Design a protein around this nucleic acid. Structure first.
Ligand SMILES: [K+]
Ligand SMILES: [K+]
Ligand SMILES: [K+]
Ligand SMILES: [K+]
Ligand SMILES: [K+]
Ligand SMILES: [K+]
Ligand SMILES: [K+]
Ligand SMILES: [K+]
Ligand SMILES: [K+]
Ligand SMILES: [K+]
Ligand SMILES: [K+]
Ligand SMILES: [K+]
Ligand SMILES: [K+]
Ligand SMILES: [K+]
Ligand SMILES: [K+]
Ligand SMILES: [K+]
Ligand SMILES: [K+]
Ligand SMILES: [Mg+2]
Ligand SMILES: [Mg+2]
Ligand SMILES: [Mg+2]
Ligand SMILES: [Mg+2]
Ligand SMILES: [Mg+2]
Ligand SMILES: [Mg+2]
Ligand SMILES: [Mg+2]
Ligand SMILES: [Mg+2]
Ligand SMILES: [Mg+2]
Ligand SMILES: [Mg+2]
Lengths: 182, 50, 116, 116, 204
RNA sequence: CGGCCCGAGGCGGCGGGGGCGACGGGCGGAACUUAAGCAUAUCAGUACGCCCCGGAGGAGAAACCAACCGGGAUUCCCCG
């Protein structure tokens, strides 16, 4: 018992740890434009979980691919975008933490114009687990088998009530004071 | 000096050992007329910088 | 005179290690007699004949201990300069892209003669 | 938390494991008995050294220490050393003063060697 | 069409609110790091492919920070001697651009790699940041690939030291052809030596 | 508790470093001298200093020249 109180608040952390913590503070503090702010407000957890359950039944081959010496979801930004551009995507799922953010900043605008519903979902890492890759920016449903439209048509309804594009482009983010946040 | 490093002792030791005349049988063997080894040195007039 | 290198070929390692022990000891005797004569010349090079063979039998043994390994000791690697070890292979230098190749099979090389 | 400082976490450390040997053949060096000893120095001053004081004077390779000299002399001349003094002469050679055990006659040992 | 047509269009609006925010977060971060730093992946994937990057084993990316402004001569006490045309000390300009200086700094730090190309990522009042593409030329994926294994041949060592990259080419004047460029094509030194030669023929 | 992201220590295989009185590429860069003085000019985009290759190097398949009853990537030679 060297110290009677707790010393953790006063540790001098390594440089790499301090920079990523201060980066997270700077985005609560500054004034975030709406096109960037929309990636800070993903879909809720309940609706995300019950899309991930639908999606893992259109999941590609995992570990038969060494044993190979179906309707499936699509992955990747190059292929997704040409499907929205030809009106074949029925749902796009966009990740929330794409590090170069300009790869997808324009993509909700495109889906809106072309008439495709979309949803921002947390952690690109999770989407990669849906297609047996490490990470991915986006996935898309192109069609489903008939037993699943009693859920796909209902999931589109919950998406429509929850993702609002008009207020997405009008609201700024950030601007949080220290004493205010607590 | 009476207090010298082994590295300076060894280089001084080699100048002492090679400070010699041509052997006389070498003068007969190689048929020489120059008989003085002009790489010799003498302690009074030398400046070995070793 | 003295030992032939051919007549130690065929001798075992023990019969060569044991033969080297006497040669070393004999040069001690002959250096002691010198400082206190034709043989002493031949003995110095008998020692070199044997060590030549002990090393030549040991290199041929080890160079088969590694004959089929991926990584070989650097003493047993080919004899090349530093620049040669770093050059591209002729196959690597002759590789062409797929589209570029499929156009060289079209339009081959032809012999022809023109007239005045 | 007791200490206020952050130190590097403790992580596994491996031992080395080269895929090929860097020295596939074990070669000899300068040191071995009958090569470390060169010859004895024979003078009337040095003969007195043997008849009384039971001591033999030798020239040896400069890289040899007193413990290597004791062992070499004991294995080559099959006797018992007691104490070894050494110096490097103004010409660069190493001289060893080798005193035999109080129950050995260096006359008996110098004679068999030829020193007398 | 594909996605990189939108990304290129976006990067032509650097004054917009969106890119003004993202350019602000990047300069704060790069100010917290060292001058030469290895990156996991390119910060601009579409520009990286435009200049020749490929997501394969053997391609690497480093970020380089260089300082802004003009040049000061190395003269003790600020004294040039000699003729008055040669007296100036401050207010001079470097002969090579800052993009070329970035490539040369990282070539000196990493002399066992081959520099390929570079591009802009950020700037503020004191610094500009560039990213440099480098190839490891002894990797088997690099050597056995006809698209890139031109750089595995030894006339490609330390290219940025000899002025052979794109930014180094511009300072030598080589982005031009025709009138205004006739005295530089092999080299400035080579054209001078050719134009000033006395050729004394046998049947003069 | 796992994933992804951003880092740390170790281990294995492979590569780098230095060397040359020429030719070649990239930088920094004089003064003597001439002007019958001397500041711009000239000497000279030279001496010399630093870095980097090869058996050659550099350059190169037009954001070219032209003004014609037109030529057609680069280098080198003759010519003004
Ligand atoms: K002394
Ligand atoms: K003297
Ligand atoms: K800097
Ligand atoms: K002056
Ligand atoms: K002057
Ligand atoms: K002048
Ligand atoms: K140019
Ligand atoms: K011109
Ligand atoms: K003529
Ligand atoms: K100059
Ligand atoms: K001058
Ligand atoms: K001058
Ligand atoms: K003057
Ligand atoms: K003058
Ligand atoms: K003038
Ligand atoms: K002048
Ligand atoms: K001038
Ligand atoms: Mg070589
Ligand atoms: Mg040996
Ligand atoms: Mg002593
Ligand atoms: Mg290592
Ligand atoms: Mg002159
Ligand atoms: Mg004058
Ligand atoms: Mg005058
Ligand atoms: Mg004057
Ligand atoms: Mg001029
Ligand atoms: Mg070339």
């Amino acid at each position: 018992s060297k110290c009677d109180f707790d010393l953790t608040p006063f540790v001098r952390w390594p440089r790499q740890v301090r920079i990523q913590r201060q980066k997270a503070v700077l985005q609560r503090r500054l004034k975030v434009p709406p096109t960037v702010n929309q990636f800070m407000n993903p879909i809720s957890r309940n609706l995300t979980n019950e899309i991930f359950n639908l999606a893992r039944k259109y999941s590609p081959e995992s570990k038969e691919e060494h044993k190979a010496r179906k309707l499936v979801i699509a992955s990747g930004i190059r292929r997704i975008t040409s499907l929205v551009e030809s009106k074949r995507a029925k749902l796009v799922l966009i990740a929330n933490d794409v590090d170069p953010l300009e790869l997808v900043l324009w993509l909700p605008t495109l889906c809106h114009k072309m008439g495709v519903p979309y949803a921002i979902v947390r952690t690109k890492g999770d989407l990669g687990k849906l297609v047996h890759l490490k990470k991915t920016t986006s996935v898309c449903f192109t069609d489903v088998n008939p037993e699943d439209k009693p859920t796909f048509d209902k999931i589109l309804a919950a998406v429509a009530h929850e993702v609002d594009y008009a207020k997405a482009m009008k609201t700024y983010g950030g601007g949080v004071r220290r004493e205010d946040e607590a | 000096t009476a207090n010298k490093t082994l590295s300076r002792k060894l280089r001084l030791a080699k100048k002492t050992k090679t400070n010699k005349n041509i052997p006389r049988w070498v003068i007969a063997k190689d048929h020489l007329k120059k008989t003085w080894n002009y790489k010799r040195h003498h302690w009074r007039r030398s400046h070995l910088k070793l | 005179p003295g030992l032939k290198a051919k007549d130690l070929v065929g001798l075992s390692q023990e019969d060569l290690q044991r033969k080297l022990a006497d040669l070393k000891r004999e040069l001690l005797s002959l250096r002691t007699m010198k400082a206190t004569i034709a043989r002493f010349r031949v003995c110095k090079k008998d020692v070199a004949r044997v060590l030549t063979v002990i090393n030549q039998k040991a290199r041929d043994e080890a160079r088969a201990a590694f004959e089929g390994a991926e990584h070989i000791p650097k003493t047993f690697r080919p004899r090349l300069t530093h620049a040669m070890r770093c050059q591209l292979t002729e196959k690597q230098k002759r590789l062409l892209p797929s589209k570029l190749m499929k156009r060289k099979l079209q339009f081959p090389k032809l012999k022809y003669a023109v007239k005045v | 938390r007791t200490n206020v400082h952050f130190f590097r976490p403790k992580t596994l450390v491996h031992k080395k494991a080269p895929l090929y040997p860097r020295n596939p053949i074990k070669k000899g060096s300068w040191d071995d008995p009958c090569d470390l000893l060169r010859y004895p120095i024979k003078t009337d001053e040095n003969t007195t050294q043997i008849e009384k004081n039971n001591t033999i004077v030798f020239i040896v390779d400069r890289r040899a220490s007193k413990p290597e000299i004791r062992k070499a002399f004991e294995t080559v001349f099959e006797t018992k050393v007691a104490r070894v003094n050494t110096l490097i002469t103004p010409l660069g050679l190493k001289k060893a003063f080798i005193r035999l055990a109080p129950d050995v006659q260096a006359m008996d040992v110098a004679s068999k060697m030829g020193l007398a | 069409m594909g996605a990189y047509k939108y990304v290129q269009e976006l990067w032509r609006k650097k004054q917009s609110e969106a890119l003004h925010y993202l350019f602000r977060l990047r300069t704060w971060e790069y100010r917290q790091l060292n001058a030469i730093k290895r990156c996991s992946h390119p910060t601009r994937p579409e520009k990286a492919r435009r200049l020749g990057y490929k997501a394969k084993r053997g391609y690497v990316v480093y970020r380089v920070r260089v300082r802004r402004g003009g040049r000061k001569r190395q003269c003790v006490h600020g004294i040039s001697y000699g003729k008055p045309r040669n007296i100036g000390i401050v207010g001079l300009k470097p002969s090579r651009s800052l993009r070329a200086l970035a490539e040369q700094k990282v070539g000196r730090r990493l002399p066992s790699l081959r520099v390929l190309n570079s591009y802009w990522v950020a700037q503020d009042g004191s610094y500009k940041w560039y990213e440099v593409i480098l190839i490891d030329p002894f990797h088997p994926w690099i050597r056995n690939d006809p698209k890139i294994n031109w750089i595995c041949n030894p006339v490609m060592k330390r290219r940025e030291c000899r002025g052979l990259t794109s930014a180094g080419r511009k300072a030598r004047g080589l982005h031009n052809k025709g009138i205004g460029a006739m005295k530089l094509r092999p080299s400035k030194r080579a054209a001078w030596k050719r134009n000033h030669t006395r050729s004394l023929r046998r049947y003069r």
